[PDB]
């Protein structure tokens, strides 16, 4: 047996309770500028039904610009109804639950439930823990006699939405002067997931296959846990997989680090082995940094929250694995640095998930696809916590044919 978070299920109709169920306000969201009603499934981890843009002026109909036939897929009626949201709520659930399947995956969740962004950034002195910045808050509304109002705060580690104009995009959002998601403070990850709605690629018409939803949001969560850790690195930072490659180069897509790093796999050591060695002696020298913080903590913003001090120094430590020296200060244990590192960066990866769930999954990162596709997964008989889409059902459990495309009838058109 393996330590596993419990996953809580819930309906999208089951009235709120100040304590799992809560209106929260997410101003990040443009796209919606009044409190929207959230699910805490495991603990900090809320799903919210509720599709997302952070755009100015945002809208959920195909722009008018370039758009991928293979890659992008534009309905602005979609998660607009309750039913819809029930729908997404239980399909959240079910993946979490499909998650826990491996070990792999329960130590993934625990990541993040224990991975709380840290209260401060570089700007906060050194001897002060930081409550207040919305790196760590959502705030909790009530609506009282007509109007909504803030009534609390959660402290969450990961945000699960519904998705954003395109509905088919999970990359790692633009991030994006202080970036704690990059110096070891961490903030809270905000998703935006579509599990009905499925790329596809080629093991290479026989050759097409979907991906799993559980892959997808593992990969999601995979950028939740290096932003909860200190260490997405820029969207800034990328390289071509390729490339020249000579007289007639150039590039292909240049492709993001912090993407290369969560799919994982020999594709990784396209970014040279110096950029690679910067990138986590960096993250040493923010988890030192934030060690010396813990040792030196004796005051508080607000100044009246004290008495938090002692618990937040236990949430921290235990995060980030620090020792205690014989002095009682918390110390960088090099040797327990460099296993939580490397479980953050290689042992969290896409490949290494489509290894230990038995699914199909694409090569690389920057392999092609084709047309993409719709599958209910709430119904059994299409896919199960325990198999996916690869069920025994008309030899689907085979050389995953669950995920073929054209031998699986549920794998609808989009
Ligand atoms: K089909
Ligand atoms: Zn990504």
Not at 339 to 357: F, R
Request: charged share 20%; hydrophobic share 35%.
């Amino acid at each position: 047996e393996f330590m596993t978070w419990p996953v809580k299920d819930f309906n999208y109709s089951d009235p709120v309770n100040d304590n799992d169920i809560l209106y929260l306000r997410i101003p990040q969201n443009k796209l919606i500028t009044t409190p929207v009603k959230a699910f805490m499934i495991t603990q900090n981890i809320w799903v919210i039904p509720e599709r997302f843009s952070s755009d100015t002026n945002p809208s959920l109909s195909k722009p008018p610009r370039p758009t991928s036939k293979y890659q992008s897929y534009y309905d602005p009626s979609y998660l607009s109804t309750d039913e819809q949201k029930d729908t997404f709520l239980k399909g959240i659930i079910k993946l979490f639950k499909r998650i826990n399947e491996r070990d792999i995956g329960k130590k993934l969740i625990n990541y993040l439930v224990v991975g709380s962004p840290f209260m401060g950034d570089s700007s906060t002195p050194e001897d002060t823990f930081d409550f207040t910045r919305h790196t760590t808050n959502i705030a909790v509304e009530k609506f009282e006699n007509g109007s909504w109002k803030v009534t609390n705060i959660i402290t969450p580690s990961v945000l699960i939405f519904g998705p954003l104009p395109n509905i088919l995009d999970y990359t790692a959002s633009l991030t994006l002067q202080s970036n704690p998601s990059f110096e070891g403070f961490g903030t809270l990850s905000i998703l935006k997931v579509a599990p009905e709605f499925l790329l596809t690629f080629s093991d290479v018409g026989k050759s097409i296959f979907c991906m799993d939803p559980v892959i997808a949001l593992m990969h999601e969560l995979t950028h939740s846990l290096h932003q909860l850790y200190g260490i997405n690195i820029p969207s800034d930072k990328r390289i071509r997989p390729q490339v020249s490659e000579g007289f007639f180069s150039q590039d292909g897509p240049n492709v993001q680090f912090e993407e290369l790093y969560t799919f994982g796999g020999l594709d990784v050591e396209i970014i040279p082995q110096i950029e690679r060695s910067q990138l986590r002696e960096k993250a040493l020298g923010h988890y030192k940094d934030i060690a010396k913080r813990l040792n030196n903590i004796n005051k508080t913003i607000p100044s009246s929250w004290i008495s938090n001090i002692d618990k937040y120094k236990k949430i921290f430590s235990e995060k980030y694995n620090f020792d205690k020296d014989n002095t009682g200060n918390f110390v960088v244990n090099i040797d327990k640095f460099n296993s939580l590192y490397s479980d953050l960066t290689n042992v969290m990866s896409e490949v290494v998930y489509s290894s230990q769930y038995n699914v199909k999954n694409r090569t690389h990162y920057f392999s092609r696809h084709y047309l993409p596709v719709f599958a209910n997964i709430l119904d059994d008989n299409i896919y199960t916590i325990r198999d996916g889409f690869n069920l025994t059902n008309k030899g689907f459990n085979i050389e995953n044919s669950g995920q073929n495309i054209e031998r699986n009838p549920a794998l609808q058109k989009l």
